RNA sequence: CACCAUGUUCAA
RNA sequence: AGUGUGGAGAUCGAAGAUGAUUAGAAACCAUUGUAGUCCACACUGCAAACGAUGACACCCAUGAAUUGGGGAUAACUUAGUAUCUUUACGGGAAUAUCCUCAGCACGCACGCGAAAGCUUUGAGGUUACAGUCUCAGGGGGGAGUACG
RNA sequence: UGCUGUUGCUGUUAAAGGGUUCGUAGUUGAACUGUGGGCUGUGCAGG
């Protein structure tokens, strides 16, 4: 015998695999990160799926490159995920 | 107290069919795929004392291959099977 | 079905029972998955074979044993094996438990053709593999016979009421599962004690070539 | 009258595409859609066993160490020629669903 | 052709089953036994029965024959099969050691009874 | 054959016969008016 | 597009009951859908149900017993007077002994038996039995 | 003269099973028509030949003509059965169909239209039986309505024991082979519909073969 | 399939009106072509004068001379 | 892969 | 396919020509050959223009694949994994395991259908008949004809 | 005669989805502003 799935309270494994708009309550997949510029040496908050040109205030160097999904951070920079809330 | 009753209080039903313990579905006289399973009760020792618990499963569930899942749910509900292993 | 009304842990699995299962490789699948058998699979190996949850193995095995023990009049339980690997195992199971058995090809109409002089009407059907015992299962679906089946990770569960997830291919695995089932039925009946190990050997349950 | 085949005798699902440009039948030249025509890739020996033995004996180039060249041809037949040449035969209704995905 | 009909084949199988000990590999002696142990109008049928009876005996010496049930030999087989080893094979495997995969290792570690003693990773 | 009983000539040729008939009738009316 | 939320909800429940499920998820939700479920629940044809808030048109998870045979909306709403109740029971109910036609009246959403008892007509929403 | 070949037949002959309701409750198949003959008292069982028509199979030497017979059996008290059998001769077909009708007997639930006074007179709810293109809808009717149905379904309903019912039909109802079966299926559906009066949980009894297993074993032994 | 809207009466009325003409019996009753072609002119009986006696051969597979009169 | 066209009307 | 005006015209080829076959053969076969076949522009709007299956929306069981883009390496509180190439459209490329959304589909449970068959791709969820809109059909011919 | 079908028809193959798309009248059209407490008595209410 095993646990039957409950529609109102799904398991972690079942919920984690679902599309963001197919979850029981829809929500974002993205987040924000603190990025230290390899040339300006300064902290800038960068969207995880940034599509526009994000540049460091000091060096004026691009901190990321847009892709089809998540933005790609330039080599050398250090990033830290900020809390969702 | 089950079945159709008269104004005089007399039961007029020819008979009362069984109800599936998984889907609350009436088991018809022509099913021939519905089964009745008796599970022996066990006392403090590993020996069965005198009694059994009976499960009725409709034939449609067995044809769909969900009888095993239903029996698992019923036995867990009745306290026969343990839903998970104990803590290490 | 290790849970009893009083709450005693008498029917729970022990270390020796687990050792027998692991030694005979009763927990190994077929690297092929079935939707109904998915719940019984703990995980997958590096080589791709599926690992069967032993706790669910024991729960189904005890439940099957209690169902068999509930049958007051033995030989109303028929144990069928068309694999030719479980023919010895079911023969020894029938000896110790007192049930009927049939090995080899299942004759179509055995449970339905009532004037064939071989017409038998068992109350419980036990099969070694649903895929190869499909004919017996199909006929049982016409005469209200519940089915207990040894099922591997890819077995079809149509008209199967109690499925024991195990390795139903290997000679040693088939013998051990029937040996454990026979021992549990005897313990549930009370003809043997649980503190003393069963004197019978699983090698007799093992199938041997007629050479 | 009755729908004989689910795929209607061709590899063109209802919402895959509109038109497949036809090809000329290998035997008679009849135009048939490429996805419908019976396609066979044939690798034939230039010589049978006896003639190849004689030519290899007379050849300083070809022998046990160097094989003779073969003919490579993609042959697409119209349905009529495929049946008449016995490249393909009418089959029992239950056997019509049997498909092969590699040359046996 | 010289195919033996079911009448000859069935009678020959019955003759072998009932009088196996009295038969041998010689047609003429087998035929002489058959004249006494069978009732039939046809001498030709009896001769055909003897021919296939000798054929069955020759096949029996090499191995078992489907449809021929000889009580003494089948009991001789099952008594031989009953002979059990001194120690159980499962006990020998446990004594020599048990090796399980990583996934089995995780499952046993999660079990309430824990890891069995002589079960080790591989 | 790939069709059921036509119960007549091939429908394409019956359509052509009708088409020629319509052409003749509209020519006759044209010469009349 | 989806024209009737109530029809979508009732059809989803009827299909789940027909398939023998123990739970069914409903989307989207509405006040009318909730009131219909409560009338069903008050007569015992469904068990518990939970309304999940998503800051949008919410969702409902309904616990199904084995008693519901069929439920469905009636479209268009087909306003019904107090003298038309017997006509609707004859047309869309399996029997005069069980089953309910659910109406929306100025006294609220209720079954036809309660509507007749309170002497009010309305518009037919659906049925269940 | 009757030698039961089934455990149910042995129990019926030994009078361990006394009513068809026990057979119906556990949904056991009935393989011997003598079971129905014994369990139904003399005079309470009636049978009628519904339809006999010939069928033909073309051959190289003409055609082979057989006869298909439809037989209805009932007690006018909630039990109905239909048997269809083909034979080389009409009399053989009739006898075989009577046996088949007994083997196919089913219970029929009867109910009330309005007030529940006296014995049930109609069906409890609307039912529909389908066979081929033929579908028969049975609708509960008030007392005194009678059986408003075509003669073939009316005869089946009379044998089943229904007194008042409305009937509508669709499809090629002149195919009486399908019409008889469609009416029979609609009647058989009466006990499969879950009504609020059947919601209460029922105590599960023992299968009579299981209960009398030791006696059945003695019959097999001797 | 058909429309179902609460305010779709005009569509349903128009749909029925157009489709009734496909009923051959309805079209005959609601047109004048049959009445014009009917020699009786819609009456149940008509009086006449016999012009000649004729014998009409019966259709196959029958074979007879049906006695008739031109009126 | 030369060339094979036709079979009076009902009814067994 | 056909039409108009300019181009173009290798190949194939309605019409036609010749040679065979045949009782006849102004058919099938063979050798040819006009209009065409190709392009530009302008007409035509007649296809088995087919999935012979209207559009939008909801529910719906199973196994193996495939195209495109992303993500990761008493009803339980979380339950892996690589291989090959690698001085410039290169922090690259493709595989492997898992998840996911969108697309063309295959063998596959209900249920449906007169059946053939259909089946998250319905022809299922329908006499237990109501999500929305729209087109067409009402025995076979006459006839898609006559008239306008 | 549910063969005119609002109730209540049919349209893969029986008669019948328009070759495709745009599109006006017309028909149809997502959720939300919300349904109250307290006291007494009473009812296998229930966990
Ligand atoms: K093809
Ligand atoms: K097509
Ligand atoms: K695609
Ligand atoms: K508009
Ligand atoms: Mg959880
Ligand atoms: Mg054909
Ligand atoms: Mg084709
Ligand atoms: Mg596309
Ligand atoms: Mg096309
Ligand atoms: Mg050489
Ligand atoms: Mg043909
Ligand atoms: Mg046609
Ligand atoms: Mg006639
Ligand atoms: Mg002829
Ligand atoms: Mg010029
Ligand atoms: Mg040329
Ligand atoms: Mg057209
Ligand atoms: Mg399409
Ligand atoms: Mg079309
Ligand atoms: Mg793509
Ligand atoms: Mg599919
Ligand atoms: Mg409709
Ligand atoms: Mg017409
Ligand atoms: Mg009418
Ligand atoms: Mg009427
Ligand atoms: Mg019609
Ligand atoms: Mg058509
Ligand atoms: Mg609204
Ligand atoms: Zn060709």
Swiss-Prot record, chain C:
Entry's Gene Ontology molecular function annotations: structural constituent of ribosome
Keywords noted in UniProt: Cytoplasm, Ribonucleoprotein, Ribosomal protein
Highest taxon above the source species: Eukaryota
UniProt-listed Pfam families: Ribosomal_S2
Gene3D superfamilies: Glucose-6-phosphate isomerase like protein, domain 1
GO BP terms, alphabetized: cytoplasmic translation; ribosomal small subunit assembly
A GO term from the CC aspect: cytosolic small ribosomal subunit
Cytoplasm listed as a keyword: yes
Keyword Zinc set for record: no
UniProt xrefs under InterPro entries: Ribosomal_uS2, Ribosomal_uS2_CS, Ribosomal_uS2_euk, Ribosomal_uS2_euk/arc, Ribosomal_uS2_flav_dom_sf
Subcellular location: Cytoplasm
Sequence similarity: Belongs to the universal ribosomal protein uS2 family.
Function: Required for the assembly and/or stability of the 40S ribosomal subunit. Required for the processing of the 20S rRNA-precursor to mature 18S rRNA in a late step of the maturation of 40S ribosomal subunits.
PANTHER family named in the record: 40S RIBOSOMAL PROTEIN SA
Assembly with partners or alone: Component of the small ribosomal subunit. Mature ribosomes consist of a small (40S) and a large (60S) subunit. The 40S subunit contains about 33 different proteins and 1 molecule of RNA (18S). The 60S subunit contains about 49 different proteins and 3 molecules of RNA (25S, 5.8S and 5S). Interacts with ribosomal protein S21.
Name of the protein in its database record: Small ribosomal subunit protein uS2
Organism (species): Leishmania major
Lineage: Eukaryota, Discoba, Euglenozoa, Kinetoplastea, Metakinetoplastina
């Amino acid at each position: 015998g095993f646990f039957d799935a409950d529609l109102s309270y799904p398991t972690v494994r079942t919920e984690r695999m679902k599309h963001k708009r197919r979850r029981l309550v829809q929500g974002p997949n993205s987040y924000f990160m603190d990025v230290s510029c390899p040339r300006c040496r300064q902290v800038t908050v960068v969207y995880s799926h940034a599509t526009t040109s994000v540049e460091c205030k000091g060096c004026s160097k691009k901190l990321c490159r847009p892709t089809g999904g998540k933005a790609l951070l330039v080599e050398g920079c250090g990033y830290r995920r900020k809390p969702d809330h | 107290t089950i079945g159709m009753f008269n104004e005089e209080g007399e039961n007029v039903d020819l008979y009362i069919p069984r109800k599936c313990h998984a889907t609350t579905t009436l088991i018809e006289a022509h099913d021939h795929a519905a089964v009745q399973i008796s599970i022996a009760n066990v006392g403090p020792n590993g020996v069965i004392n005198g009694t059994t618990t009976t499960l009725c499963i409709a034939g449609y569930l067995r044809s769909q291959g969900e009888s095993d899942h239903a029996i698992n749910h019923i036995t867990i509900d009745r306290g026969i099977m343990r839903i998970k292993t104990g803590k290490p | 079905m290790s849970a009893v009304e009083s709450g005693s842990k008498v029917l729970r699995m022990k270390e020796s029972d687990a050792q027998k299962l692991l030694a005979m490789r009763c927990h190994i699948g077929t690297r092929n998955q079935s939707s109904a058998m998915k719940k019984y699979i703990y995980g997958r190996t590096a080589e791709g074979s599926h690992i069967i949850d032993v706790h669910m193995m024991w729960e189904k095995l005890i439940l099957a044993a209690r169902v068999i023990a509930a049958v007051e009049n033995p030989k109303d339980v028929c144990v069928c094996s068309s694999r030719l690997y479980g023919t010895r195992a079911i023969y020894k199971f029938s000896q110790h438990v007192g049930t009927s058995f049939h090995g080899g090809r299942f004759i179509p109409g055995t449970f339905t053709n009532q004037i064939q002089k071989k017409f038998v009407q068992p109350r419980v059907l036990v099969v070694t593999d649903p895929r190869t015992d499909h004919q017996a299962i199909r006929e049982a679906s016409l005469v209200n016979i519940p089915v207990i089946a040894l099922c591997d990770t890819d077995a079809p569960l149509e008209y199967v009421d109690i499925a024991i997830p195990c390795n139903n291919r290997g000679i040693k695995s088939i013998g051990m599962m029937y040996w454990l089932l026979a021992r549990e039925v005897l313990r549930l009946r009370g003809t043997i004690v649980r503190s003393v190990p069963w004197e019978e050997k699983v090698d007799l349950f093992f199938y041997r070539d007629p050479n | 009258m009755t729908t004989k085949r689910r795929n209607h005798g061709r590899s063109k699902p209802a919402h895959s595409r509109g038109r497949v440009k036809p090809i000329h039948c290998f035997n008679c030249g009849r135009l048939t859609p490429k996805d419908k025509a019976v396609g066979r890739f044939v690798v034939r020996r230039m010589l049978d066993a006896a003639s190849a033995r004689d030519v290899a004996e007379a050849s300083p180039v070809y022998g046990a160490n160097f094989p003779m060249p073969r003919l490579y041809m993609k042959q697409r037949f119209c349905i009529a020629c495929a049946i008449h040449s016995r490249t393909v035969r009418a089959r029992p209704v239950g056997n019509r669903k049997i498909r092969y995905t590699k040359k046996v | 052709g010289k195919i033996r009909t079911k009448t000859v084949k069935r009678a020959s199988r019955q003759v072998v089953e009932k009088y196996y000990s009295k038969l041998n590999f010689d047609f003429y002696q087998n035929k002489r036994v058959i004249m006494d142990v069978t009732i039939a109008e046809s001498k030709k049928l009896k001769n055909k029965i003897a021919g296939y009876t000798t054929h069955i005996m020759k096949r029996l010496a090499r191995g078992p024959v489907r449809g021929i049930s000889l009580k003494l030999q089948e009991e001789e087989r099952e008594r031989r099969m009953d002979h059990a080893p001194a120690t159980s094979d499962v006990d020998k495997v446990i004594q020599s050691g048990v090796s399980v995969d990583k996934k089995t290792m995780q499952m046993l570690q999660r079990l309430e009874i824990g890891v069995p003693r002589r079960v080790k990773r591989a | 054959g790939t069709v059921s009983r036509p119960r007549g000539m091939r429908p394409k040729w019956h359509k052509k016969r009708i088409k020629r008939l319509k052409l003749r009738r509209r020519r006759m009316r044209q010469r009349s008016k | 597009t989806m024209m009737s939320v109530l029809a979508n909800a009732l059809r989803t429940i009827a299909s789940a009951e027909r398939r023998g499920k123990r739970q069914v998820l409903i989307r989207p939700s509405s006040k009318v859908v909730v009131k219909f479920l409560q009338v069903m629940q008050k007569h015992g044809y469904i068990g518990e149900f939970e309304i999940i808030d998503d800051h949008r048109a919410g969702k409902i998870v309904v616990n199904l017993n084995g008693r519901l045979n069929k439920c469905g909306a009636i479209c268009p709403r087909f306003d019904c007077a107090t003298t038309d109740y017997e006509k609707w029971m004859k047309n869309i109910l399996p029997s005069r002994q069980f089953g309910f036609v659910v109406l929306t009246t100025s006294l609220g959403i209720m079954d036809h038996e309660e509507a007749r008892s309170r002497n009010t007509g309305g518009k037919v929403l659906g049925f269940f039995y | 003269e009757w030698v039961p070949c089934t455990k149910l037949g042995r129990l019926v002959k030994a009078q361990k099973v006394t009513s068809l309701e026990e057979i119906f409750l556990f949904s056991m198949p009935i393989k011997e028509h003598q079971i129905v003959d014994t369990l139904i008292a003399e005079g309470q069982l009636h049978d009628e030949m519904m339809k006999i028509y010939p069928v033909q199979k073309a051959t190289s030497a003409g055609q082979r003509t057989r006869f298909k017979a439809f037989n209805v059996v009932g007690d006018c008290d909630g039990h109905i059965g239909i048997g269809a059998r083909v034979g080389k001769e009409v009399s053989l077909a009739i006898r075989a169909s009577m046996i088949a009708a007994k083997l196919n007997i089913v219970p029929v639930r009867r109910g009330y239209w309005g007030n529940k006074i006296g014995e049930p007179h109609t069906i409890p709810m609307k039912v529909t039986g389908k066979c081929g293109s033929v579908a028969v809808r049975l609708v509960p009717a008030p007392r005194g309505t009678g059986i408003v149905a075509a003669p073939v379904p009316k005869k089946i309903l009379e044998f089943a024991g229904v007194e008042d019912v409305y009937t509508s039909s669709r499809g090629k109802t002149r195919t009486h082979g399908n019409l008889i079966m469609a009416t029979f299926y609609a009647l058989r559906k009466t006990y499969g519909f879950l009504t609020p009066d059947l919601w209460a949980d029922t105590e599960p009894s023992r299968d009579p073969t299981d209960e009398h297993a030791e006696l059945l074993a003695e019959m097999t032994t001797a | 399939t058909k429309t179902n809207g609460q305010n779709a009466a005009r569509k349903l009325v128009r749909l029925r009106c157009r489709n009734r003409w496909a009923d051959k019996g309805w079209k005959r009753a609601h047109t004048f072509s049959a009445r014009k072609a009917n020699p009786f002119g819609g009456s149940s009986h008509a009086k006449g004068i016999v012009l000649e006696k004729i014998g009409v051969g019966a259709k196959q597979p029958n074979s007879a001379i049906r006695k008739c009169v031109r009126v």
